[PDB]
Structure 1
Amino acid sequence: NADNYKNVINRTGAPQYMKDYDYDDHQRFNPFFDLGAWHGHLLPDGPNTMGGFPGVALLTEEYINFMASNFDRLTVWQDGKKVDFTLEAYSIPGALVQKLTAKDVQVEMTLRFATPRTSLLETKITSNKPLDLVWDGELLEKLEAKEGKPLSDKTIAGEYPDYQRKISATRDGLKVTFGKVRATWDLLTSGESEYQVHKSLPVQTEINGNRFTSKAHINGSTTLYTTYSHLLTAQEVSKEQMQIRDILARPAFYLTASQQRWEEYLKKGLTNPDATPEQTRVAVKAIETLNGNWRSPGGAVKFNTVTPSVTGRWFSGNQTWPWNTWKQAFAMAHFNPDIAKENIRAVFSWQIQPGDSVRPQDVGFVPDLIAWNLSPERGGDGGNWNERNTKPSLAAWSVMEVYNVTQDKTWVAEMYPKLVAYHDWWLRNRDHNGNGVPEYGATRDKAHNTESGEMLFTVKKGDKEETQSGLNNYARVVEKGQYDSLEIPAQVAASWESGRDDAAVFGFIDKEQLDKYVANGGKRSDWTVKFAENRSQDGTLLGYSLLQESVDQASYMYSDNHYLAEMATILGKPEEAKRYRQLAQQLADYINTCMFDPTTQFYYDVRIEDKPLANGCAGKPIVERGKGPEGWSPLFNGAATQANADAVVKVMLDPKEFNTFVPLGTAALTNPAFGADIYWRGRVWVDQFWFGLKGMERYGYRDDALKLADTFFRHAKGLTADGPIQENYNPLTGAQQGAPNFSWSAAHLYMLYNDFFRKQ
């Protein structure tokens, strides 16, 4: 029951700036969103906010921007005298609650969500005499701050002259109008968006520039109702009036709907009886977090989706990525299965079709990033929407977990063809050596190449830049190697497509570390990831590949074939299933044979060397760039043989390798590029962690995973505090880092609850 879980996350705070950013540019507060709505609310922290839920957070299509600190804050007056209240404020799963206590008057305010654009406040007043009610509010003025401190003296209206915010009174409340602003990286409004306030009683309203006062009289105890609605289009504004009228006409129905929606989340969700109360509350933090990141249809995205973080700088709006989607939907299938199915649908709703007007050669491609606004290339003015690359595909796994939970045959029939086209695209456009095993890469694009299809790249040295074109020139410039750095947009995009930005296995390594690598007898060339282009037989360019085959990528492909075979068998396709089992078999054979080094007893990526080996392997395992989580991807995805897996677990459990203060980080201590505070070269991510625990388990090492889970739990910082879920942990110290309310950490924290956490 909800009440058992008060203040799981700290949702207090009084924003002072539109961008009230923390150190990494994320909104430093944690607003309550639900039902996919495009606004959210914080709790009051003291006297100045008491009587209201401060911090109206607006989701301006692709970003989170605060509107007001105080907005619709109640204050109570009896015989011209202000009533003095003391405050209790708390969140629960699915609602914010605050109570104001005094001698002769008491107020109970409960804020829940009614529709995907409209939240509902219930104000329950209890009094033995008549009362005068004052609500007040004030829009924000100041622009930007970091850690509470201002970065400038810039004002919101200065920065956006065409915003022209205007508070206006109405027949049953007030409203805020917003002018058109197309600040592509900051603030995005249609020109007809609004924040509407509607009340269940007549009120009298005074507007004073960018603040308001509103008054009313009541005879005694009474429960009144208020709607708050952020609406982004003229068409939304019209289509809501009707739904506001039905909420005020029957509030209890909507409270009850929400109230019940959440009891069912918690019921379906909290299914591990071995878990401790502390661990069960971590699971609920994740469910809240995950549900908060759920957005309803909005702009170009016709489905309900889930973003990496609603308070994130670049993860807000309905901006959706396939990678974290699979992880999110795997977890949310175990509690909010409806929206898990929609998240998957949303990612596949812009899958490339035959005859596409941008990339007809990318059929099956699933974009890296979809959002409210399409790219100029597709008709919109969006700067985030991205088809430079996809991301690593665990689609079939994620789709199969929803079916595991629901048993819905029609779900599998819906998805199968979407997945098969994605599978086919990998093999056609990401297998430079037609050898059956994928590379990470990039697509053909404005940013990657000329209109002739000649790959762009910039050569840098000292203060000198030199943009050039063509794979011929690129090859040469690399051979000579007379540059400080070499920027290839297409190669930059394949690091995105890898899922890891700074990774050792893709050649990234700081001066001082590389120097010690050389002093230990390495050559600098060992860290140079070559790059090539994929052409059809017709000579058409299809994209690019890293001249390197990644072991995680091959493992995910094994999974893809594995699950597509089961899906095929379920849909009564025995011959398509036999073919996927065979592809799977060839991938396991290639992974074990080509990517496992018996010497160091672990898996690694392979180079696509200029000529293949005697055993069909495109190259030798890239052991010289150290070990990392990809090493146990074959265990997780089930590609590994019992023996090879036995070896990998030996390494994983070794204190000098991956078994650290927080285990299973993103580079072993023995990696040459290792850095404890480096995101993808040391720091522990919960997904990788969990892939690893599952991997041990699958090959008989459940009790060892349970140990590591207990270590993770005792050591990972803040896990049982009330702070938002973040991205990763330093493996030596436990410090958290990365964006608050990070979905996939929630996805996988939740699954750690479901699989491995227990009473010790």
Structure 2
Amino acid sequence: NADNYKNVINRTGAPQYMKDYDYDDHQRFNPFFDLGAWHGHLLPDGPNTMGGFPGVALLTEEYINFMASNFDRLTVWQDGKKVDFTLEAYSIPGALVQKLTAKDVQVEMTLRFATPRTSLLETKITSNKPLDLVWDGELLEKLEAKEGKPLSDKTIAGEYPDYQRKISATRDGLKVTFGKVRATWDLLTSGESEYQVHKSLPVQTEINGNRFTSKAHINGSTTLYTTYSHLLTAQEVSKEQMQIRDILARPAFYLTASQQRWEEYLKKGLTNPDATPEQTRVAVKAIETLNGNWRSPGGAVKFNTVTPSVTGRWFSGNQTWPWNTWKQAFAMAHFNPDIAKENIRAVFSWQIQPGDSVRPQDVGFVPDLIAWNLSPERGGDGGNWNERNTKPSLAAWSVMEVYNVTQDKTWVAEMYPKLVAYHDWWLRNRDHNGNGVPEYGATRDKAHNTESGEMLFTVKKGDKEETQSGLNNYARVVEKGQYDSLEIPAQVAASWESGRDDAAVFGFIDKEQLDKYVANGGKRSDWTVKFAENRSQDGTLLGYSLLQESVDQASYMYSDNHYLAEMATILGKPEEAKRYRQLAQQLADYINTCMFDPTTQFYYDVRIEDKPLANGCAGKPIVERGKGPEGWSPLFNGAATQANADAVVKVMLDPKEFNTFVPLGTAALTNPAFGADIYWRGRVWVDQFWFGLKGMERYGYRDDALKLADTFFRHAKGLTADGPIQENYNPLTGAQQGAPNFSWSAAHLYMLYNDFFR
């Protein structure tokens, strides 16, 4: 029953700016989106907005932008007297509801989504008398504010002179048309996009600049239906008309469709009724959040996908990342498997294929960021599309969870080959020393190297920034140490490839931190990163590797290999199954032999040193750069021996290391590069926390995992309030940072509800 969970997130708001941002540039209100639609709605905040759902949020290809404060807001007149209504408004999973109550007239408005482009409003009017209905709307004028305060006096029309918004009428409603705007970071339209309003009765619409007023007379009680459609191309506009007509012909079919779909999400999803009411509401919040970030096919992305946040400054539209998808799809397999499947298809739909025009050397590669608009390199004008790096190998894990739920063999058959191609890419383009253990690295890209193939880097000394190129040059510079710091685009890309941007283990340490490290008796050379080019015997530059093998990716590949073997077995490929099991076993051996340090009782990346060690390992574990969440990856993924897991868990539970106010953060308190304000050098993310708890359970420490989950529930700020889900937490204070409505936080909070709030 969706009605048991009213207002889990605050969805009220009356936007006054196209960009009505919070402190960190995210839209500061939380509109309701469903069915992968490309528009969203808010609840009225009071008398000024009652009668409508203010703040039509448009997803303009890659960004969320508000269109209007009031739009299609109802006012009711009875014999020339304006009805003064009492307002009650709330959200439930799958709907917005607004009730307007007066003596002689009552209105109940229920807003649900009907198609991937269309929301449906039921306006149920009860009256003992005929009434005159007036709907009004006005497009926004002002561009941008922060925390409700204008950032400039720019106007929408001033900033985007080609936008040239215009309202037009039809017999059953109205529409807004939009000119072509290609503002790479702000506002992207085709020139054919429209926002259409159609109703189940004729209305008389007048237009005055960027305002409208529509009228209708009714003889008494009636239920009216209204469709709202954001359509992004001429082809979408044409296709949606038949759906709109069907919706207005049989609105009950669509309302029931949405009611039933949401009853199923909650029935399948809420499988821990012994959780506390507050814990259950957190799960419901997570479900609402995940489904709201789902987007239907659009532009270059021909599948339903899920983005990190529909309200996010840089996460909105249909911008899609691989390891976000793997995590989200894993969680959503347990309540919305149809879309989990789609999301996985969306990512792999842009896997690099043989003969690729841009990077034929990268067959099997999965781009880091795909979106509506292709990059200039692929013939589009998209500024977000990114092929500098991929993300870690969690794909097979998510594919197999969708199979576990659906038991659909056709699914395994379609994904298996894409998973294999991805695996093969790692081993061709990210294994410099040919030992079957991957490195993180960087593709051949304008960001990383010259046209002729020389790696870029910048030397900084005082106020000087000296851009340079060439690996030979880089090696000479670092041996010599004549600089204050270095900026290396390939290093940044390697950290992005791990998903842990600017993490300590990849050589990221601030000047003060490094100075303290050296003062304490460490060497500056302990933090220098080395690189190698990966080149085929025929001269083709494949990319760059960090001369470092990372324990998380080794562990993820280990489990990925075992899932591949499970898929091969299901598909009657016994030899391929054997090969993946054997590859998995070798990775476990390497992880335990090379990446485990018995002295500090933890796992670490290893260097690829000039010569291998006596035990065959590429180099020693990088104990100097401190402990991080990669250290429990061998537990999560099942690579660790029991003895090694025993050791790791002791460190996890040590308040000196990871057992902080909010525990299991992204660097131990003992890590020389730790900061409680640094995203991937101390802050706690829900994915890495849950990976830790699952790792603990896998090796016999479930009871300890339950205690850490309880500590998280008590100390993570905002968890039981009605605010949107964010990205991470301060490990010392529990304070939140990051984009609101963040998908993988929602994913892993949901799985924490499922697995560890018990």
Same fold (TM over 0.5): yes
**Shift in Å, 1:357:** 1.1
**Shift in Å, 1:513:** 2.2
**Shift in Å, 1:232:** 0.5
- Equivalent residue for 2:409? 409
**Shift in Å, 1:503:** 0.9
Q: Deviations over 1:270-308 (max 9, x none)?
A: 112332221111111111100000000000101000000
**Shift in Å, 1:489:** 2.1
Report SS of the residue matched to 2:138: strand
| Separation in 1, partners of 2:386, 2:255 | 39
Q: Which moved more, 1:503-512 or 1:187-196?
A: 503-512
Q: Does 1:141 align with 2:136?
A: no
Q: Deviations over 1:489-527 (max 9, x none)?
A: 222211111101121111112232222212211122211
Q: Deviations over 1:560-582 (max 9, x none)?
A: 11111111111111111111111
Structure 1 residue ranges without an equivalent (≥5): none
**Shift in Å, 1:318:** 0.4
- Equivalent residue for 1:504? 504
| Separation in 1, partners of 2:226, 2:62 | 27
| Separation in 2, partners of 1:166, 1:631 | 57
**Shift in Å, 1:412:** 0.7
Report SS of the residue matched to 1:515: helix
Q: Deviations over 1:192-211 (max 9, x none)?
A: 10101111111111212111
**Shift in Å, 1:611:** 1.5
Q: Deviations over 1:609-631 (max 9, x none)?
A: 12111111111111111111111
**Shift in Å, 1:481:** 2.6
Does structure 1 retain, via aligned residues, the 8 Å contact 2:273–2:280? Answer: no
**Shift in Å, 1:585:** 0.8
**Shift in Å, 1:594:** 0.6
Report SS of the residue matched to 2:459: strand
Report SS of the residue matched to 1:197: strand
Q: Which moved more, 1:340-349 or 1:652-661?
A: 652-661
Q: Deviations over 1:305-325 (max 9, x none)?
A: 000000001110001000110
Report SS of the residue matched to 1:361: helix
| Separation in 2, partners of 1:700, 1:25 | 43
Q: Which moved more, 1:434-443 or 1:502-511?
A: 502-511
CA 1:469/1:512 → structure 2, altered by over 3 Å: closer, same or farther? closer
| Separation in 2, partners of 1:696, 1:415 | 30
Q: Which moved more, 1:437-446 or 1:641-650?
A: 437-446
CA 1:517/1:460 → structure 2, altered by over 3 Å: closer, same or farther? closer
| Separation in 1, partners of 2:471, 2:668 | 34
**Shift in Å, 1:707:** 1.0
| Separation in 2, partners of 1:477, 1:514 | 18
Q: Deviations over 1:193-240 (max 9, x none)?
A: 010111111111121211111111111111101111111001111111
| Separation in 2, partners of 1:461, 1:76 | 70
Does structure 1 retain, via aligned residues, the 8 Å contact 2:171–2:204? Answer: no
| Separation in 2, partners of 1:560, 1:216 | 61
Q: Which moved more, 1:267-276 or 1:35-44?
A: 267-276
| Separation in 1, partners of 2:710, 2:212 | 53
Report SS of the residue matched to 2:424: helix
Q: Which moved more, 1:53-62 or 1:669-678?
A: 669-678
Does structure 1 retain, via aligned residues, the 8 Å contact 2:559–2:638? Answer: yes
- Equivalent residue for 1:565? 565
Report SS of the residue matched to 1:449: coil
| Separation in 2, partners of 1:463, 1:140 | 45
- Equivalent residue for 2:108? 108
RMSD: 1.0
| Separation in 1, partners of 2:115, 2:158 | 34
**Shift in Å, 1:446:** 2.2
Report SS of the residue matched to 1:214: strand
Report SS of the residue matched to 1:90: strand
**Shift in Å, 1:402:** 0.5
| Separation in 2, partners of 1:454, 1:677 | 35
Q: Deviations over 1:361-411 (max 9, x none)?
A: 111000001100111111211111111111111001111111111111111
**Shift in Å, 1:253:** 0.5
| Separation in 2, partners of 1:616, 1:144 | 58
Report SS of the residue matched to 1:533: strand
TM-score, normalization: structure 1? 0.99
- Equivalent residue for 1:329? 329
Report SS of the residue matched to 2:67: strand
- Equivalent residue for 2:419? 419
| Separation in 2, partners of 1:208, 1:602 | 69
| Separation in 2, partners of 1:23, 1:432 | 43
| Separation in 1, partners of 2:83, 2:451 | 71
**Shift in Å, 1:466:** 2.9
| Separation in 1, partners of 2:94, 2:308 | 19
Q: Deviations over 1:508-562 (max 9, x none)?
A: 1223222221221112221111122111122211011111111101101101111
| Separation in 2, partners of 1:54, 1:318 | 23
**Shift in Å, 1:451:** 2.7
| Separation in 2, partners of 1:26, 1:393 | 29
| Separation in 2, partners of 1:681, 1:470 | 29
Q: Which moved more, 1:374-383 or 1:444-453?
A: 444-453
Does structure 1 retain, via aligned residues, the 8 Å contact 2:305–2:343? Answer: yes
* TM alignment of 1:472-511, pairs within 5 A: 472-511=472-511
| Separation in 1, partners of 2:442, 2:274 | 45
| Separation in 1, partners of 2:116, 2:713 | 35
**Shift in Å, 1:480:** 2.5
Report SS of the residue matched to 1:323: helix
| Separation in 1, partners of 2:352, 2:202 | 53
| Separation in 2, partners of 1:52, 1:708 | 44
**Shift in Å, 1:459:** 2.7
**Shift in Å, 1:726:** 0.5
**Shift in Å, 1:461:** 3.0
- Equivalent residue for 2:10? 10
| Separation in 2, partners of 1:525, 1:281 | 50
| Separation in 1, partners of 2:484, 2:233 | 49
| Separation in 1, partners of 2:160, 2:640 | 56
| Separation in 1, partners of 2:168, 2:517 | 66
| Separation in 1, partners of 2:485, 2:117 | 48
| Separation in 1, partners of 2:60, 2:667 | 38
| Separation in 1, partners of 2:636, 2:3 | 37
**Shift in Å, 1:640:** 0.4
Q: Which moved more, 1:266-275 or 1:221-230?
A: 266-275
| Separation in 1, partners of 2:296, 2:36 | 4
**Shift in Å, 1:339:** 0.3
**Shift in Å, 1:486:** 2.4
| Separation in 2, partners of 1:171, 1:82 | 25
| Separation in 1, partners of 2:184, 2:749 | 33
Does structure 1 retain, via aligned residues, the 8 Å contact 2:491–2:506? Answer: no
**Shift in Å, 1:354:** 1.1
| Separation in 1, partners of 2:741, 2:375 | 27
**Shift in Å, 1:183:** 0.4
Report SS of the residue matched to 1:135: strand
**Shift in Å, 1:450:** 2.5
Q: Does 1:95 align with 2:105?
A: no
**Shift in Å, 1:479:** 2.1
| Separation in 2, partners of 1:479, 1:161 | 54
| Separation in 2, partners of 1:461, 1:323 | 36
**Shift in Å, 1:106:** 0.4
Q: Deviations over 1:397-453 (max 9, x none)?
A: 111111111111111111111000000110000011111110101111122222322
What percent of counterpart residues are identical?
100
Report SS of the residue matched to 1:25: coil
* TM alignment of 1:201-600, pairs within 5 A: 201-600=201-600
- Equivalent residue for 2:653? 653
**Shift in Å, 1:169:** 1.6
| Separation in 2, partners of 1:430, 1:353 | 17
Does structure 1 retain, via aligned residues, the 8 Å contact 2:52–2:70? Answer: yes
- Equivalent residue for 2:715? 715
| Separation in 1, partners of 2:350, 2:360 | 13
**Shift in Å, 1:114:** 0.6
Q: Deviations over 1:236-281 (max 9, x none)?
A: 1111111111111111111011111110111111112332221111
CA 1:466/1:514 → structure 2, altered by over 3 Å: closer, same or farther? closer
Report SS of the residue matched to 2:616: coil
